[PDB]
Amino acid sequence: SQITIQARLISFESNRQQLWKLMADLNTPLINELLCQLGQHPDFEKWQQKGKLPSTVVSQLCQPLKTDPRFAGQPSRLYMSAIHIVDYIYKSWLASSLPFPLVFETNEDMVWSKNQKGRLCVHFNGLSDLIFEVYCGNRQLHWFQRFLEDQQTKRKSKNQHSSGLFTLRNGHLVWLEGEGKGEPWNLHHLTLYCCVDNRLWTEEGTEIVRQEKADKQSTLTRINNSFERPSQPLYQGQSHILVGVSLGLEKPATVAVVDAIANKVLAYRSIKQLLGDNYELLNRQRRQQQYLSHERHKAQKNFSPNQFGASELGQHIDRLLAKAIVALARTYKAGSIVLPKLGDMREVVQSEIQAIAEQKFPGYIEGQQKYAKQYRVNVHRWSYGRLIQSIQSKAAQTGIVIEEGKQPIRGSPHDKAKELALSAYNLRLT
RNA sequence: AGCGCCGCAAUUCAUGCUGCUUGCAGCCUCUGAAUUUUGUUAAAUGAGGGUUAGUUUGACUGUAUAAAUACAGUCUUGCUUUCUGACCCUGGUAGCUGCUCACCCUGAUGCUGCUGUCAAUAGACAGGAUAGGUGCGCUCCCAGCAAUAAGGGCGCGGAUGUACUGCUGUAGUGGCUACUGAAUCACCCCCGAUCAAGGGGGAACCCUCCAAAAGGUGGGUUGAAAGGAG
């Protein structure tokens, strides 16, 4: 699946300042001016009647800005970066003191080469003089090494390699703000974000992609190419087994590995089981959540800038749950991980508070509402969207599917997980 | 008092265990779920602001496997995050500034709360998280204040006046920028780059050999995990 890999690009002060002048003082002005000229263009409104502006506008407004004196000329790929950035920003709008990123559509825009010291280096097409190396960890090193090897593998074939099978597919070159003062090229740390596809790493995965990619002069000309390709068996997840993930307030995500054929349950993996040594994180996140809503509502107008919202502990917990759920779907050979819909979750939470209140104080409504009010204080709504996103990401990475479900309104959390998995299996026939 | 968490107990169980008839039967050593109970000089959550290009969390190749996986060997690079651990501080001055304030009444997802000494409310040297609630946390409670939610009272110089200000400072409390002191570590320590870069020196535990023991070798562990950037 798609995944973005980071790397710190490193070169000398001369090359860095050259790039800085190109971007911050000769292309960031280009970006801003193209943005206003999009704003100050006579037929601005007529396109909003459709709600989308096609690629025509930037295509015709790209070239008049080549010889504008304040721009001092850019390499062609930097013009492509600018036009793609304005495309991205106006698409994000139609729904700081830091230069706009650089956008590279394909890998051929990046040339890789080993130096005498052995490290990988990357230049960009149309630049050819800046020798930005690549800095990264082992979790990313094999990625860049494989990009270099595929580059070396296309040239030996006299450039008869299809571009899709290449591992690296996109790339973002951005500056990142830091501390200190002085010049900003030696202050903002350049970083390369590489977008790849794991589906195109394992040899079996690579051979999977050829069939649909044909779906016309060179449609099948250079499909077959060996590369260097590790062969690892594709994870063949058998169906008939679903891992429902009941989402709730007190138990945010409890799973039950259901064998739906005989309605037998294979594994009631609770959250204390889905997290292990990471269970201590769960309550911790709530300790932060109850904190934030206390401070966020305190400064009602958001006037006071404080540190609330400090950590991404929710993100880490949520991806930990994703990893554990996919691992526990593998261990029982599950053919899906089942999640409910966030659209059908606003009522689920409130039904849960009401049911817990009734089971704690039966009939005594004036005490039921009291208990519910002090229960909303202590246990807050989970970041369910992050959970669903991270679980879908890990499921795509490993290969298991995510299908829609329908959480039951009442019952035990394990009972809700089991019945949610069964409901998803029932909907699977549809 | 109330509520959420933690797991100490019991009970009932299984998602757990036993040779099966392979789905049933039986019992709670390991792994857990629920209900109730309990808070023990006990188990386990939790406990303030920062700090590493940190270690493990990798990839490939042969074997074993019905396999998650284990071993052997080759390479290795540092990106962004989460814990844990260790460590450092609870900032100094120079500005732009917020936000509120006759005196009152209860009081608000209102504010503050650590030990100790001097000292007088208000706070200075020095310790430092174990920062009020004896299991822990809290929009709950308490102690204090409340001008810094409301909301309702109520006043001296003034107003052409019908509105509004003084009693508002030589305050209380939050932001922004700049110069600044300590950590700049992941077994410990020294030297370096922090657009690059690693190399020394050492202690704790090892597997094994020279022998006969000790001692002296070769290799290895000295916390782990996660990741799609918008």
Main pleated sheet = 5 strands, antiparallel
Provide the spatial order of strands within the biggest beta sheet. 2-6-7-1-5
Count of domain modules: 2
Tally of separate helices: 14
Give the beta-strand count. 12
By secondary-structure content and strand pairing, the structural class works out as: alpha+beta
Helical residue percent band: 40-55%
Mind telling me the C-alpha Rg?
Answer: 26 Å
Report the principal-axis shape: globular
Give the amount of beta strand, in percent. Answer: 15-25%
Series of H and E elements: EHHHHHEEEEHEEHEEEHHHEHHHEH
Instruction: Note the gap between the termini.
Output: 26 Å
PDB class: dna binding protein
Keywords: complex, transposition, DNA binding protein
Assembly: dimeric
Entry title: Cryo-EM structure of Cas12k-sgRNA binary complex (type V-K CRISPR-associated transposon)
Write the layout of secondary structure elements.
Elements (H helix, E strand, L loop, with lengths): L1 E9 L2 H13 L2 H12 L4 H5 L7 H7 L13 H18 L8 E3 L5 E5 L5 E5 L8 E3 L2 H19 L11 E9 L12 E9 L5 H11 L27 E7 L5 E7 L4 E4 L3 H5 L3 H20 L14 H19 L5 E3 L6 H15 L4 H14 L5 H15 L3 E3 L8 H16 L2
Parallel strand pairs: 8-11, 11-12
Antiparallel strand pairs: 1-5, 1-7, 2-6, 3-4, 6-7, 8-9, 9-10
Helix pairs in contact: 2-5, 10-13, 11-12
The structure holds one RNA strand of 230 nucleotides.
PDB class: dna binding protein
Keywords: CRISPR, complex, transposition, DNA binding protein
Assembly: dimeric
